[PDB]
Design a protein around this ligand. Structure first.
Ligand SMILES: Nc1ccn(Cc2cn([C@H]3[C@@H](O)[C@H](n4cnc5c(N)ncnc54)O[C@@H]3CO)nn2)c(=O)n1
Length: 135
């Protein structure tokens, strides 16, 4: 999925933090144009990248999606978020994909890892790399 110019942290930011429009159909064009497919579901967290990095500092927990991974972290508090769901596919013209939008206030669990040594900025040695669950 992930284009080669992005670190996993930059991809996380692109998929889940930088909602470029408050409208799902428009915001999703960015993700979809990058991955060359209309993503079926996607959550944007209405929080800051710095706040998610802080969540990486919360206690480690098992990742809901993988019982073998212990690099997950619970947000502690709820945040506002928007879930985008594909309503109108368009695999031969990605730009014509349309989405529904669902606002909610929920907890989240992220997986974090050490930053990309060559490409992530040194400011944040530990970065979110995957949104594992919304609760
Ligand atoms: N260019 C490429 C190269 C490979 N892939 C496959 C791929 C897809 N993923 C996603 C999850 O499998 C992976 N992931 C899930 N759980 C965890 C976890 N506990 N800790 C670190 N990461 C996790 O994070 C990625 C973000 O959703 N990772 N690799 C790709 O899509 N594009």
């Amino acid at each position: 999925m992930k284009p080669p110019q992005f670190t996993w942290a930059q991809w996380f930011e692109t998929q889940h933090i930088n909602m470029t429009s408050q409208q799902c159909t428009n915001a999703m064009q960015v993700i979809n144009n990058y991955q060359r497919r209309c993503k079926n579901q996607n959550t944007f967290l209405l929080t800051t990248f710095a706040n998610v990095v802080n969540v990486c500092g919360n206690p480690n927990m098992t990742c809901p999606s993988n019982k073998t991974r212990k690099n997950c972290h619970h947000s502690g508090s709820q945040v506002p978020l928007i879930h985008c769901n594909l309503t109108t596919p368009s695999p031969q013209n990605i730009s014509n994909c349309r989405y529904a939008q669902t606002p909610a206030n929920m907890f989240y669990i992220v997986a974090c890892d050490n930053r990309d040594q060559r490409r992530d900025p040194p400011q944040y040695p530990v970065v979110p790399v995957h949104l594992d669950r919304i609760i």
